[PDB]
Design a protein around this ligand. Sequence first.
Ligand SMILES: N#Cc1c(-c2ccc3ccn(Cc4ccc(CN5CCCCC5)cc4)c3c2)n[nH]c1N
Ligand SMILES: N#Cc1c(-c2ccc3ccn(Cc4ccc(CN5CCCCC5)cc4)c3c2)n[nH]c1N
Lengths: 201, 216
Amino acid sequence: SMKIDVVTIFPEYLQPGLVDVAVHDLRRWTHDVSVDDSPYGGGPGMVMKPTVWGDALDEICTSETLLVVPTPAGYPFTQETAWQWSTEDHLVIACGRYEGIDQRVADDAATRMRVREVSIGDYVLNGGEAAALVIIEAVLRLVPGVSLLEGPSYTRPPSWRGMDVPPVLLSGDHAKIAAWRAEQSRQRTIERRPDLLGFDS
Amino acid sequence: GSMKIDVVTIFPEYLQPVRQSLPGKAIDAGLVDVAVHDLRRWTHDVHKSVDDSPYGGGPGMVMKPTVWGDALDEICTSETLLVVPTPAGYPFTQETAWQWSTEDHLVIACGRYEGIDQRVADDAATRMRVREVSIGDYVLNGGEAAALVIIEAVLRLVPGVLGNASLLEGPSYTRPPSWRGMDVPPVLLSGDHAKIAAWRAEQSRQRTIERRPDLL
Ligand SMILES: N#Cc1c(-c2ccc3ccn(Cc4ccc(CN5CCCCC5)cc4)c3c2)n[nH]c1N
Ligand SMILES: N#Cc1c(-c2ccc3ccn(Cc4ccc(CN5CCCCC5)cc4)c3c2)n[nH]c1N
């Protein structure tokens, strides 16, 4: 059983019994009627003010909440992270936009609850929303009650456009197939992700 | 400058957010067009089957090459860059995003179940450029979330399309100068801009050492 609350200024993006997922429009906690301002010390782009975030998260979080903050400067979100989070009761995902969220939101929250700044990969997005969907998919499929690269998979027909299924897969020989697949996985891994086997990227 | 993106999926609804993210101005200026196609349009049977049991046995199902073959034959040309999300792909990185941002036609083939019969990509690669890629070291249910990430990372590099304008970036601060007892670091208000740049550099170095020591 898990509850996930996503907090965003772009709730429209997210519209698509063991688990519930709620999307909250951060603008509902605004004081006047602008969440962003210019960065201290200068620099391009705008920064989300901590004030609106503080009120929102106050209402939504408890001290047992795991606060997840997507950021391109975060710790790596990996399958190990996903296993770790799959047994949590309550995740709140704070989605930023502009050039991100004032650092004091995460620093303050970390005095009241567990906080995790994470990145889903080494590319730049426009905000936390797409990252939130990745994190949610990766975690929810591991919730109770739901190393190497995988080799190639095949199905019918056995011959297609003159291209044949590797004959070993039609042999019915379990041990030869397990061997052949173990081989394919290791060959794909060394070619595409040599770092996984301890070699230079 | 301008890009056509075709996405093929059995869940075209999952692609609603990319349409939600596209500004009307960029569409009307003909800078971008994103079409989403239901794979089942190309099925052959009354049950609209897209999957079948794996040769060699195993759990899960494999997506049928004949259905994918027809769909891609229709949508792709020899000038297409065919992108295939997969948990066994080459890493998709910012370098990848930069390279693809200058393409004229991207087609993203989103798999489900255990993935797509390998002959589909192998066949396609004999007449177009094909890229099997993974967006990170975690496991998803299919290619659709990866296509959202890929499309966003690529399109924000195409000038004027999404509306937007090595170490990890350090922390940022804005108003108010004091909040819940935490002050913005005084150096940022010192007006000494060489010292500010040095302070930011050192924050970046510390954060990188702590969060991503591999980058060093
Ligand atoms: N997870 C994850 C992510 C994200 C992600 C997550 C959350 C937010 C909230 C806002 N943005 C956009 C953004 C983009 C660039 C920069 C750095 N800039 C570089 C120099 C000029 C100024 C700042 C900051 C903020 C976000 C991006 N991107 N990539 C991932 N794997
Ligand atoms: N990009 C990207 C991705 C994807 C991604 C991309 C495309 C598809 C199409 C289907 N799936 C789901 C799936 C999940 C697991 C497995 C491995 N199996 C499980 C155990 C038995 C052996 C085989 C295969 C297929 C996809 C996942 N995941 N993570 C990324 N970074």
